[PDB]
Amino acid sequence: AQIGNCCTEQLCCVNDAVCCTIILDDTGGTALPIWDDATTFVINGTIMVENNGTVGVGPTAALTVNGTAVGGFVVAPGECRSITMNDINSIAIVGAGTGTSSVKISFSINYKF
Amino acid sequence: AQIGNCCTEQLCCVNDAVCCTIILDDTGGTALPIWDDATTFVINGTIMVENNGTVGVGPTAALTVNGTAVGGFVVAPGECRSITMNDINSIAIVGAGTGTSSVKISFSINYKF
Amino acid sequence: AQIGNCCTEQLCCVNDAVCCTIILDDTGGTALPIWDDATTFVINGTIMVENNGTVGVGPTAALTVNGTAVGGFVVAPGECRSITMNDINSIAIVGAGTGTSSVKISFSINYKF
Amino acid sequence: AQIGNCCTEQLCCVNDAVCCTIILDDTGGTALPIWDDATTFVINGTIMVENNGTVGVGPTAALTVNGTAVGGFVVAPGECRSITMNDINSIAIVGAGTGTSSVKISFSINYKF
Amino acid sequence: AQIGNCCTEQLCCVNDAVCCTIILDDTGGTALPIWDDATTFVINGTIMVENNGTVGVGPTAALTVNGTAVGGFVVAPGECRSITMNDINSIAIVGAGTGTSSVKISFSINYKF
Amino acid sequence: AQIGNCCTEQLCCVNDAVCCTIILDDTGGTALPIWDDATTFVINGTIMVENNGTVGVGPTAALTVNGTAVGGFVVAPGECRSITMNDINSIAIVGAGTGTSSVKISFSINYKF
Amino acid sequence: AQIGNCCTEQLCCVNDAVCCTIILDDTGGTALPIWDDATTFVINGTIMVENNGTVGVGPTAALTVNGTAVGGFVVAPGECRSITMNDINSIAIVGAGTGTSSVKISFSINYKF
Amino acid sequence: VGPTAALTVNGTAVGGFVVAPGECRSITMNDINSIAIVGAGTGTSSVKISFSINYKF
Amino acid sequence: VGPTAALTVNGTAVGGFVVAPGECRSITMNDINSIAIVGAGTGTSSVKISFSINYKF
């Protein structure tokens, strides 16, 4: 006769979204911190960067995740680019150019607890 | 007497949406990268492209997925077109014409983890 | 004694919505492609067409699904009409009249994977 | 010893909402089609009609469901009225009066598949 | 040996929201119908009334549910009031005063089927 | 041999949100009723009060829950404050000062039925 | 023969979001209370602070959680910063500088009950 | 994508008992003293092992 | 990440019975009088223990 039940430990799934806009200028190769992870969970999601600055004038932006720049992820003004990834712990933006640009960063955090 | 339980490995289902607007000009047949996949998951979803440029003037846009152009997916100004697909790993846009057009790209990412 | 568990293959249910606006003119009976299916899933949902053009001037719009026109689905300016259906694989619009109309097409895609 | 499992056939529950606005005039008792059902499912939901036209001038609107007028469901300008029902297959509006009114129709479709 | 499975009859849970705005004047104690129930389900939810009319001039509004006025539920201009309840079958508003007020009624319908 | 199944009585989880704006003046210590509970459920959620009135002029607002003032919950103009709690049955606001302030009250109702 | 069923105690998962805007000035190192916990639950979530004040003029803001300042979490004007954490019981903001800044605080509360 | 699995019993691999992803395989035997699994491939796979022990005492 | 677990029976640790995360291990035995678990590592792990009691009376 069975005693007790192994059952399960049902986990709630969190799917949040974050959006903000920044005035990006030349930072000399330094990554401006945007998002950091302080938990022990495993986090997936998609990161989107849109550069709305003036075309051909505003600085370009590059994404950095986990302290390593994403291969070829540079956004020129008048463009957007999105990338999906797993095990994301840090998100930062590096600006390069002259002038200032209105750069919008959005990202989804998906995990379970 | 049963020992343990096979049970399950319940998976959280992620359904995200992305939208951006770009200034599309003549790119000479080169595909501008919009979305790329860096995970091992299987991703489904719908991709919508709307060309709001001036009618009869602005360049046309064509969708490219998995490095192969979608058959007949060309959008003239003043139109929108959407397509649903499975196993999507890359999304890019190719512009053709003269002038500049305000082209809006949206897409849904659906998967489970 | 049972060995293993038949269990299940739980499926994530996708419910997406799409909306766009087009400038519809006389197309001479040709159906403008709006949505196409490239997957092997079974797709249900509701399709809504609203013709906001000037009353009594703008062209009328007719819905076409699966390559067959929907019986009596013609929308005059200043009206909206919606229809729910199952096993939807294609959506197109046919315009008839003189002038141009701002016609809004929305539709829901519901399925499971 | 049990062979296989009866288990279940879990059904995804669809809960969609639709909203549109129309310019309603005198139709001479004819019902303008708003929503029709082409599936074999059982559909429940709530239907709301709001008449925002000028008070005491704009025509009144009446709801019709399943080809039968709802008892006493007439909305005067400056009012809204909602009704919940089960087994809904058709929704139409009948206008009566002089002039034109901006009438907003919303409705929820709830079912399972 | 068990034959068949009692299993369950899983029910989809519907949680809808409705909002509208009305021009409320003196109705002489008569309740203006806002929402009515025509189903056999048990419906819960919260009802909120906000009176945005001019302060100290516009008429006051009172809520009526199930044909009985809610104890002390009178809203003066420049105020909102919300109440949660179970087994809701009718919602109506009674206006009292002089002039006209822009009164916003919102309510949530929660049930299972 | 087992007869029947204990199974479960699965409960639908309701998570609603309410928001309104009021013109708050001096009430002489009297609590203006905002939300009341008339059900037998156990309700949790978060309550947020934002005072957008002119800085240093508009009256301050204080939250009252279950007939007892929350310790130190007073909001000055140009501020917002939120508090999460369990077993919430009443929400009211007490204004103190001179003049009028545009005070926004929002709150989430979370329970199961 | 089994008597009864261990079954489960299914828990509803609450995922709420809060947003407000404040006029932040120099507080002399004192933490302005933004959010406090009065329940016995375990709360996770992400906290985002965006400083929209004038660039190079408005005061900077620093986040404080659980009575301890977050390492390096200082936001200059024209920036946003977000951090995810578990076991969150208090959120406060400390302003430092000269002048006033429009600082937006948002945060997600995720738990189960 | 996922690696394949092979069963080993009594320290000797079972002839041809390799399971590809999306499959199950079962084998009945007598005088069983050890059960082990050998994985081969790239990536990770969710592999379920079940077994019945029948004896008398 | 999660700590490893080791089985102890009759007050003596079972030779080599250490389970790493993402694994299961089972052992059959006779004359069992005590079962205990020893954890070693950093963090917390959800560890499931099952066992069958067979006897006659």
**Inter-chain CB proximity F83 and G35 less than 8 Å:** yes
Decide the pairing of beta strands C60-65 and B90-96: unpaired
Longest CA span, chain G: 76
Half-sphere exposure of C60 (CA within 13 A, CB side): 10
Would you say A37 and A111 are in contact if contact means Cβ atoms under 8 Å apart?
Answer: no
Contacts of A40 in chain I (CB under 8 A): 1, 43
Would you say C98 and C13 are in contact if contact means Cβ atoms under 8 Å apart?
Answer: no
Closest residue by Cα to residue E45 from I49, B13, F109, I4: F109
- What lies within 8 Å, CB to CB, of B90 at 6+ separation is B33, B35, B36, B37, B64, B65, B66, B67
- Tell me whether residue G50 is exposed, middle or buried, using C-beta atoms within 10 angstroms of its C-beta: 0 to 12, 13 to 18, 19 or more: buried
Backbone φ and ψ of E23, nearest 5°: -100, 105
- What lies within 8 Å, CB to CB, of H45 at 6+ separation is H2, H3, H5, H21, H39
What residues form DSSP beta bridges with E33? E92
Scored b (16 or more CB within 10 A) or e, F43-55 reads bbbbbbbbbbbee
Would you say G103 and G110 are in contact if contact means Cβ atoms under 8 Å apart?
Answer: no
> In units of Å, what resolution does this entry have?
3.3
Size of interface A-B (CB pairs under 8 A): 77
- Strand order from edge to edge, sheet including C32-37: B13-24, B101-112, B44-51, B79-86, C32-37, C90-96, C60-65, C68-75
| Secondary structure (3-state) at A31 | coil
A79 alpha carbon, distance to own chain's centre? 16
Chains touching chain E at 3 or more Cβ pairs under 8 angstroms? D, F
**Inter-chain CB proximity E82 and F35 less than 8 Å:** yes
Closest residue by Cα to residue C97 from C70, C59, C67, C69: C59
Contacts of H34 in chain I (CB under 8 A): none
Alpha-carbon distance values, A76 to A23, A55, A80, B67, F61 (Å): 15, 8, 8, 22, 48
User: For residue B99, what is the enclosing H or E element?
Assistant: none
Residue of A nearest to G15 (CA): A14
- What lies within 8 Å, CB to CB, of C68 at 6+ separation is none
CA pair distance F81, F79, nearest whole angstrom: 7
Closest residue by Cα to residue F70 from F97, F101, F44, F31: F31
Give CA angle at G111 (G110, G113), nearest 5°.
Answer: 150
- The CB density around residue G69, as the number of other CB atoms within 10 Å, is 15
Closest residue by Cα to residue B98 from B22, B28, B50, B20: B28
F with B: touching (≥3 Cβ pairs within 8 Å) = no
Backbone φ and ψ of E51, nearest 5°: -105, 105
| Secondary structure (3-state) at I46 | coil
C with A: touching (≥3 Cβ pairs within 8 Å) = no
What residues form DSSP beta bridges with I36? I8
Closest residue by Cα to residue E113 from I47, D104, D38, D109: D109
Length, in residues, of chain H: 57
**Inter-chain CB proximity A34 and G108 less than 8 Å:** no
Closest Cα in chain B, distance from residue H49 (Å): 9
Contacts of C39 in chain B (CB under 8 A): 44, 84-86
CA pair distance A48, A26, nearest whole angstrom: 20
**Inter-chain CB proximity D22 and C112 less than 8 Å:** no
Residue entry with tokens 């190769």: A29
Radius of gyration for chain D, computed over Cα atoms and rounded to the nearest angstrom: 18
| Secondary structure (3-state) at C23 | strand
Would you say G36 and F36 are in contact if contact means Cβ atoms under 8 Å apart?
Answer: no
- What lies within 8 Å, CB to CB, of H23 at 6+ separation is none
Would you say A110 and A45 are in contact if contact means Cβ atoms under 8 Å apart?
Answer: yes
Contacts of I46 in chain A (CB under 8 A): 9
Give CA angle at I56 (I51, I57), nearest 5°.
Answer: 125
With helix as H, strand as E and coil as C, how does chain E read? Answer: CCCCCCCCCCCCEEEEEEEEEEEECCCCCCCEEEEEECCCCCCEEEEEEEECCCCCCCCEEEEEECCEEEEEEEECCCEEEEEEEECCCEEEEEEECCCCEEEEEEEEEEEEC
Alpha-carbon distance values, E29 to D80, E25, E63, E92 (Å): 19, 11, 12, 11
Residue of F nearest to G20 (CA): F80
- Strand order from edge to edge, sheet including H4-9: H12-19, H4-9, H35-40
Q: Which two tokens stand for residue F106?
A: 């929002």
Decide the pairing of beta strands C60-65 and C101-112: unpaired
Would you say I23 and I3 are in contact if contact means Cβ atoms under 8 Å apart?
Answer: no
**Inter-chain CB proximity A1 and B4 less than 8 Å:** no
Contacts of C33 in chain B (CB under 8 A): 72, 81
How was this structure determined? It was done by cryo-EM
- What lies within 8 Å, CB to CB, of B23 at 6+ separation is A55, A78, A79, B100, B101, B102, B103
Would you say A70 and A64 are in contact if contact means Cβ atoms under 8 Å apart?
Answer: yes
Closest residue by Cα to residue F80 from F108, F52, F46: F52
CA pair distance G57, G77, nearest whole angstrom: 8
| Secondary structure (3-state) at G1 | coil
Would you say G83 and A38 are in contact if contact means Cβ atoms under 8 Å apart?
Answer: yes
Would you say E61 and E74 are in contact if contact means Cβ atoms under 8 Å apart?
Answer: yes
DSSP secondary-structure letter at B58? S
Residue entry with tokens 């419910």: C15
- The CB density around residue F19, as the number of other CB atoms within 10 Å, is 14
Closest residue by Cα to residue G108 from F64, E110, A108, A50: A108
Would you say B29 and B95 are in contact if contact means Cβ atoms under 8 Å apart?
Answer: no
Scored b (16 or more CB within 10 A) or e, C73-89 reads bbbbbbbbbbbbbeebe
B7 and chain I in contact, CB less than 8 A = no
Closest residue by Cα to residue G25 from G59, G49, G56, G51: G59
CA pair distance D100, A2, nearest whole angstrom: 72
I50 and chain H in contact, CB less than 8 A = no
DSSP secondary-structure letter at G94? E
Decide the pairing of beta strands I12-19 and F60-65: unpaired
**Inter-chain CB proximity A109 and G46 less than 8 Å:** yes
- What lies within 8 Å, CB to CB, of C88 at 6+ separation is C37, C43, C44, C45, C47, C65, C66
I42 and chain B in contact, CB less than 8 A = no
**Inter-chain CB proximity B3 and I48 less than 8 Å:** no
Chains touching chain F at 3 or more Cβ pairs under 8 angstroms? E, G
- The CB density around residue F68, as the number of other CB atoms within 10 Å, is 8
Q: Which two tokens stand for residue C101?
A: 């109309």
Chains touching chain A at 3 or more Cβ pairs under 8 angstroms? B, G, I
- Where helices occur in chain A by DSSP H, the ranges are none
Interface test with B, best of C3, C9, C13, C22 (most B CBs within 10 A): C22
I1 and chain A in contact, CB less than 8 A = yes
Residue of A nearest to I2 (CA): A40
Interface of F with G in 58-97 (CB under 8 A): 72, 78-86
Closest residue by Cα to residue E77 from E106, E57, E97, E95: E57
Interface test with C, best of B11, B18, B81, B82 (most C CBs within 10 A): B82
Question: Which amino acid makes up residue F59?
Answer: P
Instruction: Name the E strands within chain A.
Output: 13-24, 32-37, 44-51, 60-65, 68-75, 79-86, 90-96, 101-112
- Tell me whether residue F72 is exposed, middle or buried, using C-beta atoms within 10 angstroms of its C-beta: 0 to 12, 13 to 18, 19 or more: exposed
CA pair distance B77, D107, nearest whole angstrom: 33
What residues form DSSP beta bridges with A75? A61
**Inter-chain CB proximity G22 and F80 less than 8 Å:** yes
CA pair distance A86, A112, nearest whole angstrom: 13
Scored b (16 or more CB within 10 A) or e, B35-50 reads bbbebeeebbbbbbbb
Interface test with H, best of B40, B41, B42 (most H CBs within 10 A): B40
C57 and chain D in contact, CB less than 8 A = no
Closest residue by Cα to residue F20 from A110, B61, E104, H2: E104
Would you say F112 and G66 are in contact if contact means Cβ atoms under 8 Å apart?
Answer: no
Residue of G nearest to A38 (CA): G85
What residues form DSSP beta bridges with A62? A74, A94
Q: Which two tokens stand for residue A3?
A: 């005693």
* Dihedral over Cα of E57, E63, E68, E69: its sign: negative
D19 and chain E in contact, CB less than 8 A = no
Q: How far apart are the first and last CA of chain I?
A: 45
| Secondary structure (3-state) at A18 | strand
G21 and chain A in contact, CB less than 8 A = no
Size of interface B-C (CB pairs under 8 A): 73
What residues form DSSP beta bridges with E19? E106
Closest Cα in chain G, distance from residue F79 (Å): 5
With helix as H, strand as E and coil as C, how does F26-41 read? Answer: CCCCCCEEEEEECCCC
Closest residue by Cα to residue F36 from E93, E34, E112, E80: E80
Q: Which two tokens stand for residue D71?
A: 């008892």
Alpha-carbon distance values, H40 to C83, H7, H19, H27, I23 (Å): 52, 12, 10, 20, 17
F23 and chain E in contact, CB less than 8 A = yes
